[PDB]
């Protein structure tokens, strides 16, 4: 239990990678607060995986596009569990569209969730975080390799986290708080399943030749959130089966 | 006159690097349309440097924070000069603030100008651009090196252009349109003068030991906008006196 | 003990980060052979073998790998931790120091990696120990050292492609320090054990999806 | 003729990109010495000197630089364009091909750069010709080539620090090609003249503020 007595906040915790990160942090001993936007039933099942195995959880309905709601969620977590040790920013939106075609709505909405809300949550968490804490952003290997058309705005929104991570590391390093950007490649989830022509296309660009599992992203996040990782900061850390080699 | 007969649009053309880029493009033969937000007198002086030396210019008042106004400006340019060959996105806002302190207003406003409006202008220009065109974003060496606190949001907004540039290059490469991100280091302007303690601090991080000149950034932009640069695309290209070495 | 049944080879394992790596991998149940600088030492019933080999000597490295495999069977893990740092300006550095840094920091990395890959199980791990000087070189005197460490970026990327069909991962761990303090975001040096913890994470069963990556553990030196 | 009065040395100047570089620098008014592979050729009244030297031979490179300086005075510009590409998997590459790629692509870059820097004017330019394979290695067989070219990243960064007090810039131009087509954003190969145009821009009076940079000219191969 390397996270015994720690408090973690996970933005986007109810499905896919987020759900795996909540369960893993809780299995190492952290109390976990997490946000969800879409499904109370998915959130309940995550919360039950935490407690059936003896961990402490708080599920919070909060739309990551709304600045006020996110800051409110972080304060609710703090009232519930005390000051945060760990923040994981896992909210993320994807719309495909060419430069000439993408709707201005769709732009605004990737910026809101993938960028704005990462800063918004980081700022409120930082105001209620213990020294020696950990902020982990979940980015994308598309910050580094964009092999096809249609991903301009999504890649932009994920490459934004590179500079964010560097400058946050400088800001919070005097408090011994680490800040890192985890950059996954394709991960097998319901909305991006390891099945079909697109997945084969993507697997051809990878050195490993399978999609990543949620548990593997979770494992890396947990390592970074842990007592062994106090010297890793400002880094963008690829976990992508060699997609970006 | 390597740009004879070309048409260029410069977002933020009335002062500093933007003014130097307008004059240089026009000196190589391009017709230049440029936007300004602040000062009609600065815009008039740029427009006069273009025409006194025999070039063609259109100055457009347009706030880069306003999506509609920017798209309108690009269409006004097109009505005036015909289809664009060259777009330069040089709008840029800077507020210093720590992660824990930065006002949410100030966040929203760097995102609006440094990120959103770069895409907005690129999209409208692309819809009215000739094959074999050129899109040049003006980023920052702070995408790569953030040596002090207080720059988290500014660095984020400039590292955003890395992924934007990569995915735009993929989108527009079939049309033989190049897309590149020029990343300057400190450049001597009125609001960031090469004088005082801050400049000395910054010069100590540089291999060259002076600030860059507007004309030097302009020279590089013009090279990239030219007939020799059709094979440079998707790149983030540092011009920073070794700030990021 | 997630490495029970596994075999590791550590190029440069007798002091500092190397020693910490050997100690951590052995504590997780690995058998470990390591080089330091034909002679070797071990313990009856123990699973740690110390082999004297200079990392500039191709023959001695290749032999060391083969001795490891003789004792323990195919490798699962290789860690390349040999390293030489000589400061010198471009105008002044002796060609002998150039050649030493190239031999140890670059050549021997490829030599060990090839020999290990000829005797490694599918699902294996190769971890190079690079440096944050590959990305940020803030002072003079480091040109050839930085060169030698930035070489590992390209190597890691191409080796990950080569070996990915065998499910072998290949990663480059880039430490910072283990005048500079103004550059460090967290205001201390790294501990050998910290570097070792990251190596052991990558060497283990949870890291099969991390490959081709250069991964910085440098207190924010390169931010 | 922005290089009138200037002196350039081009390591590997007899064919393709090297030839185009020599041709462009001379057209801008530079005196140009170049190597190709003690013998040399020139024209009476001309300012282009062709010197036979193998880039793996330290002595011959150092001599070539000194011959250039004998003819033309201190250098203003050096372009390092020698290059060897041998394909081979990690498990199979011959150590001789490793050593050849290390000698030519890495060692000789440092050797020429040091000798040039001992005989160069303040305000000078050093341009290494690297490869986009430093950043993206999409297929197997390129590990050692990629290694050799990613080495230039660190070298460029440290040399720019070393030489910045003398106002000498140091940059690494990374070409892509001059199966792959699916990787290219613009759908053609680059022309030798294009690479040369970029080199000449960096070599010139407008580029004094570009230093330490790795600058990609690769049709979007690495995007
Ligand atoms: N292939 C991949 O799956 C892959 C690759 C690279 C990077 N990533 C990154 O990994 C992260 C997690 O995505 P995933 O792959 O597990 O995708 P997913 O299963 O489709 O779920 C996306 C996650 O983001 C949350 N989210 C999105 N918009 C939100 C909003 N407005 N408010 C609150 N939460 C919101 C979702 O919660 P609700 O459903 O409750 O709204 C959900 O937990 C994202 O940042 C993503 O870009 C994923
Ligand atoms: N040290 C440096 O100077 C430096 C270093 C790295 C990167 N850069 C980048 O270079 C670019 C140019 O800046 P500069 O250094 O020449 O700075 P500057 O002299 O202070 O001017 C900033 C430019 O951005 C324009 N701008 C800002 N907000 C705008 C808005 N809402 N609408 C329209 N135009 C707007 C300005 O036009 P108006 O005044 O008419 O509003 C002006 O031309 C920016 O993207 C900047 O981040 C500069």
Author numbering:
A (entry chain A), B (entry chain A): 5 to 249
C (entry chain B), D (entry chain B): 5 to 41, 51 to 191, 205 to 249
Tell me what the authors wrote about this structure, in their words:
We have previously identified an SDR from Serratia marcescens BCRC 10948 (SmSDR) that was able to convert 1-(3-hydroxyphenyl)-2-(methylamino) ethanone (HPMAE) into (R)-PE. SmSDR is a 3-oxoacyl-acyl-carrier-protein (OACP) reductase of the classical SDR subfamily that catalyzes the reduction of its authentic substrate, OACP, to (3 R)-3-hydroxy-ACP, participating in the fourth step of 16-carbon palmate biosynthesis.
In addition, we obtained the F98LF202L·NADPH complex crystal using the soaking method. The 1.90-Å SmSDR mutant structure (F98LF202L·NADPH) was determined, showing a clear density map of the mutated residues F98L and F202L. In the F98LF202L·NADPH structure, a clear density map near the bottom of the pocket in Subunit A was observed, which could be modeled as NADPH. Thus, the replacement of the bulky aromatic chain with a shorter side chain at the region of residue 98 greatly led to the loss of the hydrophobic contacts between two arms. Unlike the conformational change altered in the β-ketoacyl-ACP reductase from E. coli, SmSDR reveals hardly any conformational change upon NADPH binding, providing a stable configuration of the cofactor-binding-site framework for catalysis. The other crucial H-bond with the 2′-phosphate group of the nicotinamide ribose structure is from the conserved basic arginine located at the end of the glycine motif (Ser18Arg19 in SmSDR; Ser17Arg18 in SeOACPR). Analysis of the NADPH-liganded structures between SmSDR and SeOACPR shows that the 2′-phosphate group of the nicotinamide-ribose points toward loopβ2–α2.
